[PDB]
């Protein structure tokens, strides 16, 4: 249908214009206007752990996203399976909170 072809072109133009608009504003800032002639330390792994926890939970959420779009088709069996999955996720979350791995302040 011409509708899907039209929407394909519209999406492409929107993306090209959006990124083009940002570049235009940036290149304008660079050109428009005058200009004057003119190791020992590290961050705590608490930053990594938050990111690592995010990665693990985000990958776990992928399965729940696929289930969400197909809950009725999967039926109650699927519900029981997802329930076990969510329980394991919550159990690990409880472990992280109880071991204090989820408290920014010491």
């Amino acid at each position: 249908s011409t509708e899907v072809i039209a929407h394909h072109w519209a999406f492409a133009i929107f993306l090209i214009v959006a990124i083009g608009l940002c570049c235009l504003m940036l290149v304008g800032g660079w050109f428009l206007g005058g200009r004057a002639r003119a190791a020992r330390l590290r961050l705590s792994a608490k930053f990594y752990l938050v990111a690592m926890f995010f990665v693990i939970f985000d990958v776990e959420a992928l399965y729940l996203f696929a289930w969400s779009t197909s809950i009725r088709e999967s039926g109650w069996v699927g519900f029981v399976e997802a329930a076990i999955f969510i329980f394991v996720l919550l159990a690990g979350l409880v472990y992280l909170v109880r071991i204090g791995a989820l408290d920014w302040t010491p």
Binding site: F87, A91, G92, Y95, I99
Partner: peptide
Amino acid sequence: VVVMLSIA
């Protein structure tokens, strides 16, 4: 699971 909840 139970061992993890025990450690918790």
